[PDB]
Design a protein around this ligand. Sequence first.
Ligand SMILES: CCCCCCCCCCCCCCCCCC(=O)OC[C@H](COP(=O)([O-])OC[C@H](O)COP(=O)([O-])OC[C@H](COC(=O)CCCCCCCCCCCCCCCCC)OC(=O)CCCCCCCCCCCCCCCCC)OC(=O)CCCCCCCCCCCCCCCCC
Ligand SMILES: CCCCCCCCCCCCCCCCCC(=O)OC[C@H](COP(=O)([O-])OCC[N+](C)(C)C)OC(=O)CCCCCCCCCCCCCCCCC
Ligand SMILES: CCCCCCCCCCCCCCCCCC(=O)OC[C@H](COP(=O)([O-])OCC[N+](C)(C)C)OC(=O)CCCCCCCCCCCCCCCCC
Lengths: 177, 171, 40, 459, 100, 128, 87
Amino acid sequence: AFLPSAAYLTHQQKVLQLYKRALRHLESRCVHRDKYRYFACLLRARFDEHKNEKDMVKATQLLREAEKEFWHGQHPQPYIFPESPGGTSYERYECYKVPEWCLDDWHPSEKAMYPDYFAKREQWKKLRRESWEREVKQLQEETPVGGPRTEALPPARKQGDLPPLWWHIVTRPRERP
Amino acid sequence: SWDKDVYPEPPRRTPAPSPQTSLPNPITYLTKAFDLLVDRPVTLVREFIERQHAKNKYYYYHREFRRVPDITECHEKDVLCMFEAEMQWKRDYKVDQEIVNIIQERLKACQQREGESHRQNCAKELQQFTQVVKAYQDRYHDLGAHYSARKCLAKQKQRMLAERKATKEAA
Amino acid sequence: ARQWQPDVEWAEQYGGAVMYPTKETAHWKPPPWNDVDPPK
Amino acid sequence: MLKYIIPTMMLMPLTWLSKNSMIWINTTLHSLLISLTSLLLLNQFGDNSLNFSLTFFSDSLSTPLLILTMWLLPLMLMASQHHLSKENLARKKLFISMLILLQLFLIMTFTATELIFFYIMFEATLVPTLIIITRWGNQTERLNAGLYFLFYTLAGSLPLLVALIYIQNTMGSLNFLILQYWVQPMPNSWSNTFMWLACMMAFMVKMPLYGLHLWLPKAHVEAPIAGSMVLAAILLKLGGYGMMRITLLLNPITDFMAYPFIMLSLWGMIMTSSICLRQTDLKSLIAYSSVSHMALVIVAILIQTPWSYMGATALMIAHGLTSSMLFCLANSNYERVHSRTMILARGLQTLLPLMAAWWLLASLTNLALPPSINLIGELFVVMSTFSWSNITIILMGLNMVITALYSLYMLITTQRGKHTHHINNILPSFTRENALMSLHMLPLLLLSLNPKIILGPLY
Amino acid sequence: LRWQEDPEPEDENLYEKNPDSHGYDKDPAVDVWNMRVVFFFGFSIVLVLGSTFVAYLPDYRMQEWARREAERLVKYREAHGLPLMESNCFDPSKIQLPED
Amino acid sequence: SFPKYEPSRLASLPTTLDPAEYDISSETRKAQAERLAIRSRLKREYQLQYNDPSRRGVVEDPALIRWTCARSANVYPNFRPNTKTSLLGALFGIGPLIFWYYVFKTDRDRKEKLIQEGKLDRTFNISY
Amino acid sequence: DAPPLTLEGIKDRVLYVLKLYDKIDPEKLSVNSHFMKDLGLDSLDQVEIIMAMEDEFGFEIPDIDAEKLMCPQEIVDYIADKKDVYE
Ligand SMILES: CCCCCCCCCCCCCCCCCC(=O)OC[C@H](COP(=O)([O-])OC[C@H](O)COP(=O)([O-])OC[C@H](COC(=O)CCCCCCCCCCCCCCCCC)OC(=O)CCCCCCCCCCCCCCCCC)OC(=O)CCCCCCCCCCCCCCCCC
Ligand SMILES: CCCCCCCCCCCCCCCCCC(=O)OC[C@H](COP(=O)([O-])OCC[N+](C)(C)C)OC(=O)CCCCCCCCCCCCCCCCC
Ligand SMILES: CCCCCCCCCCCCCCCCCC(=O)OC[C@H](COP(=O)([O-])OCC[N+](C)(C)C)OC(=O)CCCCCCCCCCCCCCCCC
């Protein structure tokens, strides 16, 4: 439906995502660990019954009525992990995730308070600006004509090169800044 | 201080302390501590500042406006006379505003002072408030943002025609 | 991000024979620059 | 008034004889001295206005508008010196000359004793404003903006001219002091109906009236920052000042001529405030909020009670300071991201915390947080309109919901949430920028200590 | 192609050449003196002395007088048994009504 | 069996209950792959500018500019006065004006009649 | 509060939860044991392993990431990347 690498979900991926959603909603309905553990084994037994189904039309039909089964039997307030989307602590620390480029705008009196940090920051900046042209020419010699098909990026292929488009993955803020 | 006739107060009757218990209340000790630690240094500083005032005494005055002719005895479109009448009317309107404010202050002070029996014991202030608000309303209400002595005179003449017609039809 | 100044497309609207070309005044060309016509 | 007119004119040789590096410093210094001097106009009396000469007077309506006008010029110079840094030196001096000339026309617009001299200064303000918008505005649309601003005004104001000259032929004078004593009642007729429209529609355009407001979200948006500051803070208030002077002559016909316009304002502040909920351009949102705030001033002047005039002049001063500060805040983000799109640069409190505090205070004054003079003017107008008709509280109160909703949405979109990742040119706040915000916000908050000087002639 | 045009100049950062910039000017001495002019004549002069001026206005629009004068009149007419305010602003003896 | 989900304007149909989610046909695979290709091209075009060390500013999005231009400046060049726009412009433009005019006019006529007949209690009303 | 995670601690806890799983013998398990190719587990078993990792460390692994964690070392590297360990 919407994925960065794949254009779709396969049938096997849909079955596994239904199985995980159904177990999480069953754990929300079935709060206690032994009671959840019993009904989770029963749900695994319901998933193992039609596991060796070769007819893909029959399997798609079973998946579709199993989604109707889930939509009838879901919890109205399922458990959400706190940093997970919809959680009570989700995107809580984004106000503290200052991007690294703001350190370029510091005054020299407050850069002098951290001499070794900024001396070590400048060699990261030097590494990034000497890696940039090599990784651009890596991307354009490896992307096919008409543009990239998927959003997957290649690794570094030579000894000495960095992976293309690495800086905002590496220098991203911490989850607890 | 102020004048105790324009801002009247009834005489204060506080009861004598009649302690029934043997426990000492903290309020008397805190009152003595407030008298020693707070009230005497404040009093000494004020006595110093009052001596410094008494070294150089000088006076200010309440401005007395004499009465000029009002708008009724100004000829029509005679700006020199009706200017002075309009200024006199504006000063009298500002003073009537402050008279209503004085009577409202009396009413509110009576309501706090008499407390839970305020409804019986503040009938005189309520009656004075009703009389002065009726007089202020008959004199100045509904004139608009562009009020003048002419608008007020036209309002008074309309009210006097209504009163004369009501007196004539009732006889 | 600098101030917009008129382009050639903006300025060409003020170089016609009239300001609002209709169907009737569409064969009109602007007059010569020195206002001299050839003697034919 | 000539102790203010002559130094304002002496700012012209001051800007044209200054050294090239000194033209912002000198004009800022001496315009601040003129603004300090402007407090001598607070010699106001409870009965008489301060009547200087045959040509000039100043009551408690014109005095805060004069102090705000003379205060806004140094703040406009501070706001404009950064984006005109690369400008030619003579064009920079011509810009400062247009601001000085606009101050000169405004200070004798508000003090003009006679109404046709009020008309000439009132219309004379158009020419520097038109020049500032069309010459130093940033985009193409400034040219079209300069047409709308020019032609909604004159189409309203040329019937005023005729009307004023008619009063000159009927009363014999257009002195406002003479007209205070020689005003005759204006009865119900068709001649007096179009007399009323000719007296009122130029100021209805200047306020702006809803439905006539369309020049404003082009003129205030396409202007440079000093243009938007003087347009929102001062030039809208020429309409309210002119109404408060001209409705002396329009009684009692106003009591039914106001009914359509009051409707246009009472529903219009519901509309334009709602428009602010869906504005994508931040500067357009601030402009539509100005239309919504001036709708209350229109209602308050048309119902013509003491409480409504006091609320309307307090709301005019308060809106002047608040809207000028909001345009300066939006400009401080525009001078970093070079786009007025409000959803573009987000999460700015993580990057610019003190400027986010200025955004917070300007939003709180925009939504009329008590005890700001914004709330004093707002509340007094609401009291008077409740006395006019008790049902108006619905359209009043709902407005105060929506006014809160667009004020904080503006604050939530630009300051809160996650910062935009690809925007990395968010410089720390300059001392000039925080200074500009404080010179708006500190006088605005200090006026809550003593609001009687901004409550107008019938305080 | 299109005409001969200067490209867009890149937006300048005043903190690059002058990290102590107040944002008034690129010349640092002019920048500091523009800052001092704005802060001294804006905050030290207009705000402080102006708020002190407004705080000590000599009875702005005669409000205090009007209280004190009212405290005279009440005290005159509480004692003499007169009403505190008449409904008539003007004496009815000096008014002619249009007869009917 | 189970109550069928009825989607609304403000409560859309789930992805897992949509019948077109289970289309395995080759034309839907081509459409999904072509959408992935457009999104990957826009992604690469974005993050080549986003990861550039020399870039300092705003990566301009023509989609955002295009949205803000459509919301404001393209509306009147694409307005045609017809039956729909006239009947909506007059219902929502002068309809509420007539409504609030008659409400406030009826209220003030009733209140003015009560005051001039001496019926409205205006006893302590001296602020207005 | 909130004790910091180490790579050795994450590895110990991942192998601990996998040793408490009855379809994995704890003597054949290592950090590089592929769940399907070495341990002979199902994809449903892999979903349950990732859910036990989620319950262990208290955060959610999304399904686009969970389907690719096919050995304990990939799980440890994922938890290391999402919690920024060895700062
Ligand atoms: C005549 C003499 C007068 C003397 C007294 C002064 C009277 C008021 C004048 C104006 C004061 C405003 C100044 C501070 C705010 C602006 C700057 C700022 O944000 O600085 C942060 C900074 C400290 O923060 P930081 O940690 O360094 O960095 C900030 C962070 O980035 C992040 O910042 P942040 O968000 O964490 O913190 C901002 C915070 C944010 O908090 C809020 O926004 C919440 C406020 C609203 C809710 C609470 C208040 C509700 C109303 C009650 C109060 C009024 C009535 C009280 C009376 C009793 C009831 C009637 O705001 C405050 O804490 C400010 C406290 C005062 C708020 C006033 C109300 C503003 C609300 C909107 C309008 C409301 C109506 C108007 C009220 C006017 C009253 C006079 O403050 C300063 O450095 C202050 C500098 C010096 C200020 C001088 C003030 C006076 C200037 C006048 C000069 C001329 C006269 C001479 C007097 C001089 C006196 C010393
Ligand atoms: C911004 C857009 C809208 C702007 C609206 C501006 C106001 C609208 C009304 C203007 C009416 C014309 C000026 C009236 C001046 C009144 C002076 C006076 O004494 O009037 C009484 C006089 C009365 O005549 P008199 O006073 O000589 O007579 C002696 C008195 N009696 C009547 C007792 C015998 O009125 C007139 O002579 C005519 C008044 C109506 C004029 C109608 C023509 C103009 C129609 C409106 C045009 C408005 C602008 C159009 C352009 C729009 C934009 C492109
Ligand atoms: C004015 C119209 C144009 C608008 C723009 C103008 C800009 C130009 C600037 C010119 C100069 C400034 C002009 C305006 C000046 C206004 C200030 C002023 O004069 O004030 C006089 C006011 C007038 O008060 P007053 O009327 O009581 O003064 C009594 C009069 N005398 C002094 C003669 C006896 O002064 C004061 O209030 C002084 C008292 C001390 C100051 C207040 C202290 C407490 C403040 C709040 C503390 C915290 C409370 C709890 C909150 C907790 C935190 C949130």
